[PDB]
Amino acid sequence: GLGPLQIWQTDFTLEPRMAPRSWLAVTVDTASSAIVVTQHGRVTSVAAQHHWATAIAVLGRPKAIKTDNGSCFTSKSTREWLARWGIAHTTGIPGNSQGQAMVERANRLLKDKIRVLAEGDGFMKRIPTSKQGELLAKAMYALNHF
Amino acid sequence: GLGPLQIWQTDFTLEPRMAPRSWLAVTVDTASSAIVVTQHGRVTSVAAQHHWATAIAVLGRPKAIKTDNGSCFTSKSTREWLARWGIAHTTGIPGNSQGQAMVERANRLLKDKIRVLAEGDGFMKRIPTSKQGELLAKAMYALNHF
Ligand SMILES: [Mg+2]
Ligand SMILES: [Mg+2]
């Protein structure tokens, strides 16, 4: 009612411990601080849309999504996908310098958690491909659920 | 406090429109009625554990999970995975006849929704492999978010 606006922040961050699908797409729901992360082999417009399809299934449809000016986010294809869903998109002030410190902070907490969990299982370098999915799901659980 | 107990019901259901990964793993959180669905190529113990890793990331860790006596759920491997997480597992009364009508109902609502969404996009038979992920995420959004 007087509750926070439903605005998300989304960004891509590279994590070589998760190669070959080392591009992690991370969305922070600013109203709840919930985080959703998915893994991708390449940063393309389609990877961003696949990420947000997953995020909408888990968090519901937001009123707006804030991103940086990465081309996977400002292409015609991504713009039409967001219009199809009725979601407003902003890159904020053109040289906002900040504006998405929340997702930036999530990126760092996420990578730290993947490293500590991986090293706890004995993987000091790249995580074996077959173990990556449960390890990413474990890091996401750890940052969301208390 | 006096709130519902955190108990999930999980089951596998076959959906050929989603081949080759036509086995859908579905978990209903009975306290909230939220549903989580994932797709798999084969029904094995590991598919069930991958499903619940995803469900825990999205819903939190439950106190118990109720399933039928399917072998992917009662194997030594699945039993040890659930013990590693500290989750109690029950198959309910041995010949409960029911006991998981909630997940049974979710299975049917899910398959109906996949069919209506698929036919809305012009896929009357199997959904093209590259479109399945967003279509499953759309069906999950539709059954959870209002
Ligand atoms: Mg970026
Ligand atoms: Mg069954």
Q: Which domains does chain B show, CATH number per domain?
A: 1-146 (3.30.420.10)
Beta bridge partners of A38: A25
Among B58, B59, B136, most A C-beta atoms within 10 A, so best to mutate, is B58
Does A68 count as an annotated binding residue? yes
Q: Rounded to an integer, what distance in angstroms lies between the CA atom of residue A64 and that of residue A90?
A: 7
Q: Do B137 and A56 touch (CB under 8 A)?
A: yes
Q: For residue B1, what is the enclosing H or E element?
A: none
- Shortest distance, CA B41 to any CA of chain A (angstroms): 15
- A7 alpha carbon to ligand 1 midpoint, in Å? 17
CA B89 to chain centroid: 15
Technique employed here was X-ray
Strand arrangement of the beta sheet that strand A64-66 belongs to:
A35-40, A23-29, A7-14, A64-66, A88-90
User: Which ligand gives the minimal distance to the CA of A70?
Assistant: 1
**3-class SS letters over A22-34:** CEEEEEEECCCCC
Q: Rounded to an integer, what distance in angstroms lies between the CA atom of residue B15 and that of residue B1?
A: 39
Q: Which residue of A has its CA nearest to B141?
A: A57
Q: Which residue of B has its CA nearest to A48?
A: B134
The answer to whether the CB of A51 falls within 8 A of the CB of A38 is yes
Structure tokens at B88: 């109690």
Resolution in A: 1.7
Quickly list DSSP for A34-75.
Answer: -EEEEEESS--HHHHHHHHHHHHHHH---SEEE--S-HHHHS
The answer to whether the CB of A132 falls within 8 A of the CB of A18 is yes
B145 reaches A (C-beta below 8 A): yes
Q: Which residue of B has its CA nearest to A132?
A: B50
- B72 alpha carbon to ligand 2 midpoint, in Å? 9
Structure tokens at B136: 């499953």
Q: Do B57 and A137 touch (CB under 8 A)?
A: yes
Task: Report the amino acid identity of residue B66.
Answer: K
A127 reaches B (C-beta below 8 A): no
DSSP annotation of B35 = E
The answer to whether the CB of A31 falls within 8 A of the CB of A6 is yes
Radius of gyration for chain A, computed over Cα atoms and rounded to the nearest angstrom: 15
Radius of gyration for chain B, computed over Cα atoms and rounded to the nearest angstrom: 15
Structure tokens at B91: 């198959």
A and B: number of Cβ contacts within 8 A: 45
- B142 alpha carbon to ligand 1 midpoint, in Å? 29
- A104 alpha carbon to ligand 1 midpoint, in Å? 9
Structure tokens at B144: 């959870």
- CA nearest B51: which of B21, B76, B92, B30? B21
Q: Rounded to an integer, what distance in angstroms lies between the CA atom of residue A124 and that of residue A118?
A: 7
Q: Look-up: residue for tokens 């072998």?
A: B71
Which chain A residues are within 8 Å of B50, Cβ to Cβ?
A: 133-134
- Shortest distance, CA A56 to any CA of chain B (angstroms): 6
DSSP annotation of A126 = S
Does A80 count as an annotated binding residue? no
The answer to whether the CB of B65 falls within 8 A of the CB of B89 is yes
B80 reaches A (C-beta below 8 A): no
First to last CA, chain A: 26
Residues 6+ apart with CB under 8 A from A133: A39, B50, B53, B54
- A38 alpha carbon to ligand 1 midpoint, in Å? 15
